[PDB]
Design a protein around this ligand. Structure first.
Ligand SMILES: *[C@@H]1O[C@H](CO)[C@@H](O[C@@H]2O[C@H](CO)[C@@H](O[C@@H]3O[C@H](CO[C@H]4O[C@H](CO)[C@@H](O)[C@H](O)[C@@H]4O)[C@@H](O)[C@H](O[C@H]4O[C@H](CO)[C@@H](O)[C@H](O)[C@@H]4O[C@H]4O[C@H](CO)[C@@H](O)[C@H](O)[C@@H]4O)[C@@H]3O)[C@H](O)[C@H]2NC(C)=O)[C@H](O)[C@H]1NC(C)=O
Ligand SMILES: *[C@@H]1O[C@H](CO)[C@@H](O[C@@H]2O[C@H](CO)[C@@H](O)[C@H](O)[C@H]2NC(C)=O)[C@H](O)[C@H]1NC(C)=O
Ligand SMILES: *[C@@H]1O[C@H](CO)[C@@H](O[C@@H]2O[C@H](CO)[C@@H](O)[C@H](O)[C@H]2NC(C)=O)[C@H](O)[C@H]1NC(C)=O
Ligand SMILES: *[C@@H]1O[C@H](CO)[C@@H](O[C@@H]2O[C@H](CO)[C@@H](O)[C@H](O)[C@H]2NC(C)=O)[C@H](O)[C@H]1NC(C)=O
Ligand SMILES: *[C@@H]1O[C@H](CO)[C@@H](O[C@@H]2O[C@H](CO)[C@@H](O)[C@H](O)[C@H]2NC(C)=O)[C@H](O)[C@H]1NC(C)=O
Ligand SMILES: *[C@@H]1O[C@H](CO)[C@@H](O[C@@H]2O[C@H](CO)[C@@H](O)[C@H](O)[C@H]2NC(C)=O)[C@H](O)[C@H]1NC(C)=O
Ligand SMILES: *[C@@H]1O[C@H](CO)[C@@H](O[C@@H]2O[C@H](CO)[C@@H](O)[C@H](O)[C@H]2NC(C)=O)[C@H](O)[C@H]1NC(C)=O
Ligand SMILES: *[C@@H]1O[C@H](CO)[C@@H](O[C@@H]2O[C@H](CO)[C@@H](O)[C@H](O)[C@H]2NC(C)=O)[C@H](O)[C@H]1NC(C)=O
Ligand SMILES: *[C@@H]1O[C@H](CO)[C@@H](O[C@@H]2O[C@H](CO)[C@@H](O)[C@H](O)[C@H]2NC(C)=O)[C@H](O)[C@H]1NC(C)=O
Ligand SMILES: *[C@@H]1O[C@H](CO)[C@@H](O[C@@H]2O[C@H](CO)[C@@H](O)[C@H](O)[C@H]2NC(C)=O)[C@H](O)[C@H]1NC(C)=O
Ligand SMILES: *[C@@H]1O[C@H](CO)[C@@H](O[C@@H]2O[C@H](CO)[C@@H](O)[C@H](O)[C@H]2NC(C)=O)[C@H](O)[C@H]1NC(C)=O
Ligand SMILES: *[C@@H]1O[C@H](CO)[C@@H](O[C@@H]2O[C@H](CO)[C@@H](O)[C@H](O)[C@H]2NC(C)=O)[C@H](O)[C@H]1NC(C)=O
Ligand SMILES: *[C@@H]1O[C@H](CO)[C@@H](O[C@@H]2O[C@H](CO)[C@@H](O)[C@H](O)[C@H]2NC(C)=O)[C@H](O)[C@H]1NC(C)=O
Ligand SMILES: *[C@@H]1O[C@H](CO)[C@@H](O)[C@H](O)[C@H]1NC(C)=O
Ligand SMILES: *[C@@H]1O[C@H](CO)[C@@H](O)[C@H](O)[C@H]1NC(C)=O
Ligand SMILES: *[C@@H]1O[C@H](CO)[C@@H](O)[C@H](O)[C@H]1NC(C)=O
Ligand SMILES: *[C@@H]1O[C@H](CO)[C@@H](O)[C@H](O)[C@H]1NC(C)=O
Ligand SMILES: *[C@@H]1O[C@H](CO)[C@@H](O)[C@H](O)[C@H]1NC(C)=O
Ligand SMILES: *[C@@H]1O[C@H](CO)[C@@H](O)[C@H](O)[C@H]1NC(C)=O
Ligand SMILES: *[C@@H]1O[C@H](CO)[C@@H](O)[C@H](O)[C@H]1NC(C)=O
Ligand SMILES: *[C@@H]1O[C@H](CO)[C@@H](O)[C@H](O)[C@H]1NC(C)=O
Ligand SMILES: *[C@@H]1O[C@H](CO)[C@@H](O)[C@H](O)[C@H]1NC(C)=O
Ligand SMILES: *[C@@H]1O[C@H](CO)[C@@H](O)[C@H](O)[C@H]1NC(C)=O
Ligand SMILES: *[C@@H]1O[C@H](CO)[C@@H](O)[C@H](O)[C@H]1NC(C)=O
Ligand SMILES: *[C@@H]1O[C@H](CO)[C@@H](O)[C@H](O)[C@H]1NC(C)=O
Ligand SMILES: *[C@@H]1O[C@H](CO)[C@@H](O)[C@H](O)[C@H]1NC(C)=O
Ligand SMILES: *[C@@H]1O[C@H](CO)[C@@H](O)[C@H](O)[C@H]1NC(C)=O
Ligand SMILES: *[C@@H]1O[C@H](CO)[C@@H](O)[C@H](O)[C@H]1NC(C)=O
Ligand SMILES: *[C@@H]1O[C@H](CO)[C@@H](O)[C@H](O)[C@H]1NC(C)=O
Lengths: 472, 136, 136, 136, 53
C-alpha cells in the first residue's frame, strides 16, 4: 500500500555460508585417565551433557563435500598436535652411526600355536651392533640391538648398514608416556554460528539436502589414521553409498561407505623385550632386547564370508554407476609402503598389512550362486619403527617397542578405491578398482561430510504499518 | 515451542513469533569454560583456537548491537521506525511478503539495498535527535 | 558515601542507594595500561595473563548487558517491569525483604528460579513489541 | 557532506550536522578479514599484531557505550540531560560556543572538569530511577 | 676461463678476492669424516695463526 514503514526485527532465522574457528570439546569420561593422549588432549573444554538437535522442516540447503573447510581445519589441527607432542621428546642423532648387522638365531617352543602357519619373524629382523669408546685407547665395546629390515639400509662395504632416516631428516623417539589411542573429538563453533547437518540417509556428496538439522557441534570424530580401509568409525544408515568428486575423472579417489561393519582382528604373537641404553647426557634410547619364546609373523584375521558378501553388495552398488561393465578388484599397482600396504596403528605399534586376498576377485554376471566354506582369511603384516606418517609436512618419529603380545580388534567401515582408465576396451567391457590411494583428508571427508558451518544474521528488515511515535 | 533456527522454513508471519529463541544465543556458548583440567596450557594448539573463538563471539554480537544503537532500537526486539519503504526496494504486496515468504528468501531479494537502508535508518534517527534539541 | 562493595552488609533498603559505586567499575581497570616500559613482548608470561584479563573484563561486562537488552532495560539502573511476582519464588512480605535482608541473602533464596525469571522477563518484553506492532 | 573527521575544522554548531559520519566507524575496519591465505599461523609476527587490533577495537567502542548506558542515553546520538550548567566549568555565552569555537578547542577548555561531569551525569540518572520506583 | 672476459668496464676481476679453502666435515653418519673444498670470499675468513690456515 501507500502507508508502509521500515520495521527492524532482531533475531530472525537467517544465515549465510561462512568459515570460522571451530574449537575442540571432548567428554570427561574418556579422559581423566592421566594417559596424556596425543590428539584429544585435556585442553578441550567439556562437552554438553545433552546435545541439542533442531529439525528445520521446510529447509533445503546446498551441501558441498570436497569443498568443506572443516576438513582442512582438522588436518592442520592433527598436524599441529603431532608436531607439538614430539617436541619435548629425545632426538636420535647419536644413533646415526655405522651399524654392523647379521642374522638372528632364535630359540622357541615347538607348537607356537600353529593355527595360522604363516611364518616366523626371522629373515625380517637383524642384529645390528655398533662401537662405543672405552677407557683403554683403541678399544671398543659392541652395543647390540634388533632392527627390522625396513629400518636399515646398506650403504657400502657390505655387512655395514645405517638407519634409513640419517640422510633425510632428524627423528625424535616417541616419548613412552604418551598414548596413541584415538579419543573422540567434537568440533564446536563459537556463539553466532551453527552447523547444519544433513539427515538424509541416501545422500551423495554434493547437492540440495531437504532434511537439514541444526546442531551446536559435531559428534565424536575419532582421528584414527589408516590408508587402504577407513577403520573403526561410523557406519552409514540407509545402505552402502559410493561417493567421489567426479566418477568420470579417474584421478579422483572413490570412497565406499558401508552400512554393516566387518571386524578385522590384528595381532602380534611374538615376545618383544625392551632395553634402555643411555645416549648423550640424560637422554635414553629404548631398543628391542631379544625375542625369546614365541616367534611368528604378525597377522590379521578377517571372517571370509562377511567380506565375501560385503564385496558382493559393493559390486552391486558400483555396477549402477558403471552399467554394462564387469567389476573386478585388483591389488595395488605400486607406490610407497603406505599405499601398497594397509597401514595402521595398534597399541602404539605401526603395522603394514598385505591385503591381496581381500582385493583380488572378479564379478562377471552372477550366473551361479557358488557356495563356499566358513573360512578365515589371514593377512601377513610387517611392522615398522621409523615412521614417516606424512610425506614431508610431518615430523619423523621412532616408535619404541611394546613389551608383550599385541592385539587390536577393529571395525572396517569404508574402502578407498581408484579406477583404471581403460581406453580401447570398448568390446572388452571391464573396470578394475585398486585399493589405497588418496591423501589423509579422505579419512575425514568420511566423517565431516554431513556438516556445514553457517553464520547467523539475526538482523532483519521488513515493512509493517508501524510509525514511530514522535515525542512532543 | 521451537528450538534454535527451528522456524527457518516457516513463513515470515509465523516465524516472527520465535524471535527470542534465536536472540538468546548470540553470546552464550560452551567456549567460556576453562578446560578439562588446568606445557604452557594457555598456548596449546587448542588453547589458541579457544582464545580466538571467544573474540569472534564477542565481535559477532557487537556488529548488530552497533547498528541498534544508531537506529534508536536499543533494548527492543521489534522496533518500529519512521523510514518509509518506497517500494523501489520491493513492490510486493503486504500479503505476498508475510504469507508465502520465508525470512531467508526475503533477505536475498532485498540484499542489494541493505547497504542503503542501513544508512537511511541512521539518518532518520539523527534527524529525530536534532529536532528535539531545538524543540524542548 | 560508600566505596566498592561498601554496603554489601547493609540491608536491601539502604544498600540500593549506592548502586552506582558498584556499577562504575565493570570495565575500568588497571589492565588498560601498557607496561613499565615498551623478544615479542606480547608473548611474555606476564604478557599472556594480561591479554586474557582484557577478554575476561569484556566478556563479564557483556553477559550482564546482554540480558538488559532483551528485557528492555538498556540504559537504566533501576528498571520496572510488567511481570508479576507469583510468591512461589518467595512468599515474604514487603517489609521482610527491604528491611530484613542483604542483597546476598536475597540472591540465595531465589537462586532456584533465576533461570526461569530470566525467561519470563524476556517473553514479557517480546509480548510488548508484538502487542505494539499490531496496534499502531 | 564530509568524510570521516572531515568537519574537524568547522565550528561547534556547524560540525554537529555530521555526527553520524564519525559514529559509524567505531567497530568497522579491515581487521576482521582472515588473511591473504591461511606452523600455527596465529603466532606469526602479524598474527599477534592483528589479534590485539581486534581487542583494541572492542575496548575502545565499549568504553563510551558504558557511559551512554549509565547516563540513560543508550540508542541515541544527541541526548538531552537534566543536569544544569553551573558556568564554572565554562561561563561563555550561547553565541561564543556554538558559533565561535571548535569541538577540539571546546573539549580542551573543559578538560579539567570532565572527570566530575561524568560523575554528576551518572548520579543524576540514578536519582531519576529512584523517583519513578516510588512514583508508579 | 675465457681470456678476453669482455673487459668493457675494465675495473678488474675476482681473482685475489676469493680463496679456495678445504676443510673437514661429517657425513650423515657421525663417525666418518670427509674433506670438502669451497670458494670463500676474502671478506668472510680471517687468519688466526699457523699461517695458511
Ligand atoms: C578401534 O577402537 C577400539 C576401541 O576404541 C580399539 O580397541 C582398543 O584399543 C585400545 C588402545 O588402542 C586398547 O586399550 C589398551 O588395552 C591394553 C590391554 O589391556 C589388557 O591387558 C592389560 C594387561 O597388560 C590389563 O591391565 C587390561 O585390563 C586388559 O586386560 C592395556 O594395557 C592398555 O592400557 C594402557 O592404556 C590405558 C588407557 O590409556 C591406561 O590407563 C593404562 O595405564 C595403559 O597405559 C600405559 O601405556 C601407555 C602407552 O600405551 C602409557 O602412556 C601409560 O603411562 C601406561 O604406561 C589399553 O587399555 C583396548 O584393549 C582395545 N580394545 C579391545 C577390545 O581390545 C582399537 O584399537 C581401535 N582401532 C584402531 C585401528 O585404532
Ligand atoms: C645377536 O647375536 C648375539 C651374539 O651373536 C646374541 O647374543 C648372545 O647370545 C648368546 C646365546 O647363546 C650368549 O651366550 C651371548 O652372551 C650373547 N652375547 C651378547 C653380547 O649378549 C643375540 O642373542 C642375538 N640376537 C638375537 C638372537 O635376537
Ligand atoms: C528427515 O529426517 C528425520 C530424522 O532422521 C527422519 O526421521 C526418521 O524417520 C525414520 C523412518 O522410520 C526413523 O527410522 C528414524 O528413527 C527417524 N529419525 C529419528 C531421529 O528418530 C525423517 O523421516 C526424515 N524425513 C522427513 C520427511 O522428515
Ligand atoms: C546395507 O546396504 C545394502 C545395499 O545393497 C542392503 O542390501 C540390499 O537390501 C535390500 C533389502 O532386502 C535388498 O532388497 C537388496 O537386494 C539388497 N542389495 C543387494 C545388492 O543385495 C542391505 O540390506 C543393507 N543392510 C543394512 C543392515 O542396512
Ligand atoms: C582375535 O584373535 C585372537 C587371537 O587369535 C583371539 O583370541 C583367541 O581366542 C581363542 C578362542 O577361540 C582362544 O582359544 C585363544 O587362546 C585366544 N588367544 C589369545 C592370545 O588369547 C580373539 O578371540 C579374536 N577375537 C575376535 C573378535 O575375533
Ligand atoms: C563368519 O561370518 C558368517 C556369516 O555371517 C557367520 O555365519 C553365520 O552364523 C550365524 C550364527 O548365528 C548364522 O545365524 C548365520 O546364518 C551364519 N551366516 C550364514 C551366511 O549362514 C560365522 O559365524 C562367522 N564366523 C564366526 C567365527 O563367527
Ligand atoms: C602381498 O602378498 C602377495 C602374495 O604373497 C605378493 O605378491 C607376490 O609378490 C612377489 C614379489 O615380487 C612376486 O614374485 C609374486 O609373483 C607375487 N604373487 C604371488 C602370488 O606370490 C605381494 O608382493 C605382497 N605385497 C607386497 C607389497 O609385497
Ligand atoms: C564394531 O561393530 C559392532 C557391530 O556393529 C559394534 O557393536 C555395536 O556398537 C553399537 C555402538 O557402537 C552398540 O549400540 C551396539 O549395541 C553394538 N552391538 C553389539 C552386538 O555389540 C562395535 O561397537 C563396533 N566397534 C567399534 C570400535 O565401533
Ligand atoms: C512446512 O510447510 C508445510 C506446507 O507444506 C506447512 O504445513 C502447513 O502449515 C500451515 C500452518 O501450520 C497449515 O495451515 C497448512 O494446512 C499446512 N499444510 C500442510 C500440507 O500440512 C508446515 O507448517 C511447514 N512447517 C514449518 C515448520 O514451517
Ligand atoms: C504463494 O507462494 C507460492 C510459492 O511460494 C507462489 O506460487 C508460485 O508461483 C510461481 C509463478 O510466479 C510458480 O512458478 C510456482 O510454481 C508457484 N508455487 C507453487 C508451490 O506452485 C504464490 O505466488 C504465492 N502467493 C501469492 C498470492 O503470490
Ligand atoms: C550493621 O548492622 C547494625 C545493626 O544490626 C547497624 O547498626 C545500626 O546502624 C544505624 C545507622 O547508623 C543506626 O541508626 C542504628 O542505631 C544501629 N543499630 C545498632 C543496634 O547499633 C549497622 O549500621 C550496620 N552496618 C551498616 C554498614 O549499615
Ligand atoms: C574555515 O574557515 C572559513 C572562514 O571562516 C570558512 O569559510 C566560511 O564558511 C561559512 C560557513 O558557511 C560561509 O558562510 C562563509 O562564506 C565562508 N567564508 C568566509 C570568508 O567566511 C570555512 O567554512 C571553514 N572550514 C570549514 C570546513 O567549515
Ligand atoms: C682433514 O683431515 C685429514 C685427515 O684427518 C687431514 O689430512 C692430514 O692432516 C694431517 C694434519 O697434520 C697431516 O699431517 C697429514 O699429512 C694429512 N694427510 C692427508 C692425506 O691429507 C687434513 O689436514 C684435515 N684438514 C684440515 C684443514 O685440517
Ligand atoms: C623359521 O621359518 C623357516 C622357513 O624357511 C624354517 O626353515 C625355520 O625352521 C623356522 N624356524 C627358525 C628357528 O628359523
Ligand atoms: C546426488 O544425487 C542426486 C539425486 O540422486 C542428484 O540430483 C545429484 O546430482 C547427485 N550428485 C552427485 C555429485 O552425483
Ligand atoms: C615373554 O617374555 C617375557 C620376558 O619379557 C618372559 O618372562 C615370558 O615368559 C615370555 N612369555 C610370555 C607368555 O609372557
Ligand atoms: C568367497 O571366498 C572364496 C574363498 O574364501 C573365493 O574362492 C570366492 O571367489 C569368494 N566369493 C566370490 C563370489 O568370489
Ligand atoms: C547395456 O547393454 C544392453 C545390451 O546391449 C543394452 O540394451 C543397454 O542399453 C546398455 N545400457 C544399459 C544402461 O543397460
Ligand atoms: C589374483 O590376481 C592375479 C593377478 O594377475 C590374477 O591373474 C588372478 O586371476 C587373481 N585371482 C586368483 C584366484 O589368482
Ligand atoms: C568344506 O567344504 C566341503 C565341501 O562340501 C565340506 O565337505 C567340508 O566339510 C567343508 N569344511 C569346512 C571346515 O567347512
Ligand atoms: C527509493 O529507494 C531507492 C534505493 O536504491 C532509490 O534509488 C530511490 O531514489 C528511492 N526513491 C525515492 C522516491 O526516494
Ligand atoms: C514489481 O517490479 C517488477 C520489476 O520492477 C515488475 O516486473 C512487476 O510487475 C512489479 N509488480 C507490481 C505489482 O508492481
Ligand atoms: C541484485 O544485484 C545484482 C548485481 O548484478 C543483480 O544481478 C541481481 O539481479 C539483483 N537482484 C537480486 C534479487 O539479486
Ligand atoms: C509461579 O510459578 C509457578 C511455577 O510452576 C508457575 O506455574 C506459575 O505460573 C507462576 N505464577 C504465575 C502467576 O504465572
Ligand atoms: C528481622 O531480622 C531478624 C534478624 O535477621 C530475624 O531474626 C527476624 O525474623 C526478621 N523479621 C521477620 C519478620 O522475618
Ligand atoms: C557547579 O560547581 C559548584 C562548585 O564547583 C557546585 O556547588 C555545583 O553543584 C555545580 N553545579 C552542579 C549543577 O552540580
Ligand atoms: C567568566 O569567568 C571568568 C573567570 O572567573 C571571569 O574572569 C569572567 O568575568 C566571567 N564572565 C562573566 C560574564 O562573569
Ligand atoms: C586545569 O588544570 C591545569 C593543571 O595544572 C591547570 O594548569 C589549569 O589552570 C586548569 N584550568 C584550566 C582552565 O586549564
Ligand atoms: C685478472 O687479474 C689479474 C691481476 O693480477 C691479471 O693479472 C689478469 O690478467 C686478469 N685476467 C685474467 C684472465 O686472469
Amino acid at each position: 500500500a501507500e502507508n508502509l514503514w521500515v520495521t527492524v526485527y532482531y533475531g530472525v532465522p537467517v544465515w549465510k555460508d561462512a568459515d570460522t574457528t571451530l574449537f575442540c570439546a571432548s567428554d570427561a569420561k574418556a579422559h581423566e585417565t592421566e594417559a596424556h593422549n596425543i590428539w584429544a588432549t585435556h585442553a578441550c573444554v567439556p562437552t554438553d551433557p545433552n546435545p541439542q538437535e533442531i529439525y528445520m522442516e521446510n529447509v533445503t540447503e546446498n551441501f558441498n563435500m570436497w569443498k568443506n573447510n572443516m576438513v582442512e581445519q582438522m588436518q592442520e589441527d592433527i598436524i599441529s598436535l603431532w608436531d607439538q607432542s614430539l617436541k619435548p621428546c629425545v632426538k636420535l642423532t647419536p644413533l646415526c652411526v655405522t651399524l654392523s648387522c647379521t642374522n638372528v638365531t632364535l630359540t622357541n617352543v615347538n607348537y607356537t600355536n600353529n593355527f595360522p602357519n604363516i611364518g616366523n619373524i626371522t629373515d625380517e629382523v637383524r642384529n645390528c651392533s655398533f662401537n662405543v669408546t672405552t677407557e683403554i685407547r683403541d678399544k671398543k665395546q659392541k652395543v647390540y640391538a634388533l632392527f627390522y629390515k625396513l629400518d636399515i639400509v646398506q650403504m657400502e662395504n657390505k655387512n655395514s648398514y645405517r638407519l634409513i632416516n640419517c640422510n633425510t631428516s632428524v627423528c625424535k623417539q616417541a616419548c613412552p608416556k604418551i598414548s596413541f589411542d584415538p579419543i573422540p573429538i567434537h568440533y564446536c563453533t563459537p556463539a553466532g554460528y551453527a552447523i547444519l547437518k544433513c539427515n538424509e540417509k541416501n545422500f551423495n556428496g554434493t547437492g540440495p539436502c531437504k532434511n537439514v538439522s541444526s546442531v551446536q557441534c559435531t559428534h565424536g570424530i575419532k582421528p584414527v589414521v589408516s590408508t587402504q580401509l577407513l577403520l573403526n568409525g561410523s557406519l552409514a544408515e540407509g545402505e552402502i553409498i559410493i561417493r567421489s568428486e567426479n566418477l568420470t575423472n579417474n584421478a579422483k579417489t572413490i570412497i565406499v561407505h558401508l552400512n554393516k561393519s566387518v571386524e578385522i582382528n590384528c595381532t602380534r604373537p611374538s615376545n618383544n623385550t625392551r632395553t634402555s641404553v643411555t645416549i648423550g647426557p640424560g637422554q635414553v634410547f629404548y631398543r628391542t632386547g631379544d625375542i625369546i619364546g614365541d616367534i611368528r609373523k604378525a597377522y590379521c584375521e578377517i571372517n571370509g564370508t562377511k567380506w565375501n558378501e560385503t564385496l558382493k553388495q559393493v559390486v552391486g552398488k558400483l555396477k549402477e554407476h558403471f552399467p554394462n561393465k564387469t567389476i573386478s578388484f585388483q591389488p595395488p599397482s605400486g607406490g610407497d609402503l603406505e599405499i601398497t600396504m594397509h597401514h595402521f596403528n595398534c597399541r602404539g605399534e605401526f603395522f603394514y598389512c598385505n591385503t591381496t586376498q581381500l582385493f583380488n576377485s572378479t564379478w562377471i554376471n552372477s550366473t551361479t550362486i557358488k557356495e563356499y566354506n566358513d573360512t578365515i582369511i589371514y593377512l601377513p603384516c610387517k611392522i615398522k619403527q621409523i615412521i614417516n606418517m606424512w610425506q614431508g609436512v610431518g615430523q619423523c618419529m621412532y616408535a619404541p617397542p611394546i613389551r608383550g603380545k599385541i592385539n587390536c580388534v577393529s571395525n572396517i567401515t569404508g574402502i578407498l578405491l581408484t579406477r583404471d582408465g581403460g581406453d580401447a576396451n570398448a568390446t572388452n567391457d571391464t573396470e578394475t578398482f585398486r585399493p589405497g590411494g588418496g591423501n589423509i583428508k579422505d579419512n575425514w571427508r568420511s566423517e565431516l561430510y554431513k556438516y556445514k558451518v553457517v553464520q547467523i544474521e539475526p538482523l532483519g528488515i521488513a515493512p509493517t504499518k508501524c510509525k514511530r511515535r514522535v515525542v512532543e | 515451542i521451537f528450538g534454535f533456527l527451528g522456524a527457518a522454513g516457516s513463513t515470515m508471519g509465523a516465524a516472527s513469533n520465535t524471535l527470542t529463541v534465536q536472540a538468546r544465543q548470540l553470546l552464550s556458548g560452551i567456549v567460556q569454560q576453562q578446560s578439562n583440567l588446568p606445557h604452557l596450557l594457555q598456548l596449546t594448539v587448542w588453547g589458541i583456537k579457544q582464545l580466538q573463538a571467544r573474540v569472534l563471539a564477542v565481535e559477532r554480537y557487537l556488529e548488530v548491537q552497533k547498528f541498534l544503537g544508531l537506529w534508536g532500537c536499543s533494548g527492543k526486539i521489534i522496533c518500529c521506525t519512521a523510514v518509509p519503504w518506497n517500494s523501489t526496494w520491493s513492490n510486493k504486496s503486504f500479503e505476498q511478503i508475510w504469507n508465502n515468504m520465508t525470512w531467508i528468501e526475503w533477505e536475498r531479494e532485498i540484499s542489494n539495498y541493505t547497504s542503503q537502508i542501513y544508512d537511511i535508518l541512521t539518518e532518520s534517527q539523527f534527524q529525530q535527535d536534532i529536532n528535539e534539541v531545538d524543540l524542548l
